[PDB]
Ligand binder design. Structure first.
Ligand SMILES: C[S@@+](CC[C@H](N)C(=O)[O-])C[C@H]1O[C@@H](n2cnc3c(N)ncnc32)[C@H](O)[C@@H]1O
Ligand SMILES: [Zn+2]
Ligand SMILES: [Zn+2]
Ligand SMILES: [Zn+2]
Length: 425
């Protein structure tokens, strides 16, 4: 019996609404992807199948592009990799855009696969394309994606007889632009991209009542507020560390809508997010383009060097509530964790705690994981009472955002039992 249902909204197309009263932490839906792939920067760093990092991955001998953590993952991936393998090989050393590899997997799944549980509420065929709102600039970009797909797939797809009935590649890429989910690993790093068509019913809010979290490619949808029967379910499509101007640009450019929510009407939190000298934070925002690019490619030493040049600048510094400063602190913390600089990681991580409390209100999985990382860093350095406080807070958040069905909650229940025994001792 589903707790959610598809409905026609007044002015935001189709949506999902509650069938039954929902409480914070309630599991509403869970889905494997219709199709997914690893992202450009994580290719050959994480397993193509399970999206877990491993120092040495095994490569597909045929294409040498797909890489796996294990014989189990390589073998289990083969049916969904078989047809793209011929195309990735044939187009060596060209690697396609992530959207093109993703749509390849969509087409092979729809042609060769049994009906997907991912499409239970809503199918790829049903997805919003926003074709009547696309700008001429966007349409030109979509025409290039169509020709890129035609080139990439030529070994496996020669004509429309090898696409689903009346499948339109332009319309398919338009659907991918506004229905793609970025898959994060347990540590909330972007590692993949997938389509989850049932989950695609959820409309956006800058202050949502639901949250999604990934456990490998598996998506969990949870309530993070009380929700009444018939109330629309919403998620935030966007990173929380964004001003209303930045959200406006992304919701226009990617999603073709104007956000009417209270936060956008009032520029909620924009002033605090932009505190400090504007010349300095403009420079840090500019530097973050490179820092985030390096992070996406797991280049931790280069990330840390660029972040230290800002955090410990000889020139003017920013407050930690400035969102560009905060993103630099978080990138520096993760670089330090990966480089085993755990003292320096904890310095940066603790500085993010109050800004995260402000910018991730209520129960947000990004805050839950940040607090768990700081708790773990404290536990490693023998700060047992402070570690226990942070691991308990992480559990309070993550019982709502992750739940018992997420493997990270099992790992946190272990850190809590350990920290508790130390305190008992
Ligand atoms: C992932 S789909 C959500 C489901 C979609 N409404 C449908 O009918 O399939 C994203 C699209 O939904 C619409 N949308 C989502 N949130 C919205 C909002 N808050 N206001 C208006 N339109 C919204 C836009 O067309 C956006 O590109
Ligand atoms: Zn694997
Ligand atoms: Zn292969
Ligand atoms: Zn808004």
């Amino acid at each position: 019996p589903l707790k959610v249902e598809k409905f026609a909204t007044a002015n935001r197309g189709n949506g999902l609404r509650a069938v039954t009263p929902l409480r914070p932490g309630e599991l509403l839906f869970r889905s494997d992807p219709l199709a997914y792939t690893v992202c450009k920067g994580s290719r050959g760093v994480v397993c193509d199948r399970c999206l877990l990092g491993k120092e040495k991955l095994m490569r597909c001998s045929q294409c040498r592009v797909a890489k796996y953590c294990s014989a189990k993952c390589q073998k289990k991936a083969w049916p969904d990799h078989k047809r793209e393998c011929k195309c990735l090989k044939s187009c060596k050393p060209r690697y396609p855009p992530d959207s093109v590899r993703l749509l390849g997997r969509v087409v092979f799944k729809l042609m060769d696969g049994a009906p997907s549980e991912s499409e239970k509420l809503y199918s790829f065929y049903d997805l919003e394309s926003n074709i009547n709102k696309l700008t001429e600039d966007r349409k030109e970009g979509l025409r290039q994606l169509v020709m890129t797909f035609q080139h990439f797939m030529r070994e496996e797809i020669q004509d429309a007889s090898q696409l689903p009935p009346a499948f339109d590649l332009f319309e398919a890429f338009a659907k991918v632009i506004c229905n793609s989910f970025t898959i994060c690993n347990a540590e909330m790093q972007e590692v993949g991209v997938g389509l989850y068509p049932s989950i695609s019913l959820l409309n956006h809010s800058c202050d949502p009542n639901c949250s999604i979290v990934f456990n490998g490619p598996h998506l969990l949808l949870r309530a993070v507020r009380d929700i009444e029967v018939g109330e629309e379910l919403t998620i935030c499509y966007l990173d929380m560390l964004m001003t209303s101007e930045e959200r406006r640009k992304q919701l226009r450019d990617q999603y073709c809508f104007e956000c009417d929510c209270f936060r956008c009407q009032t520029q909620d939190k924009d002033a605090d997010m932009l505190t400090g000298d504007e010349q300095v934070w403009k420079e840090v925002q500019e530097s973050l383009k490179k820092i985030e690019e390096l992070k996406a490619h797991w280049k931790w030493e280069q990330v840390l060097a660029m972040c230290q040049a800002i955090i410990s600048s000889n020139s003017e510094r920013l407050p930690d509530i400035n969102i560009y400063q905060l993103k630099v602190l978080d990138c520096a913390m993760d670089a330090c964790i990966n480089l085993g600089l755990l003292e320096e990681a904890l310095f940066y991580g603790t500085r993010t705690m109050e800004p995260y409390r402000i910018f991730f209100p209520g129960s947000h999985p990004v805050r839950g994981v940040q607090v768990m990382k700081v708790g773990k860093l404290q536990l490693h350095q023998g700060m047992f009472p402070q570690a226990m406080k942070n691991l308990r807070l992480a559990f309070d958040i993550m019982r709502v955002t992750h739940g018992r069905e997420h493997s990270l909650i099992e790992d946190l229940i272990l850190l809590l039992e350990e920290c508790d025994a130390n305190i008992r001792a």
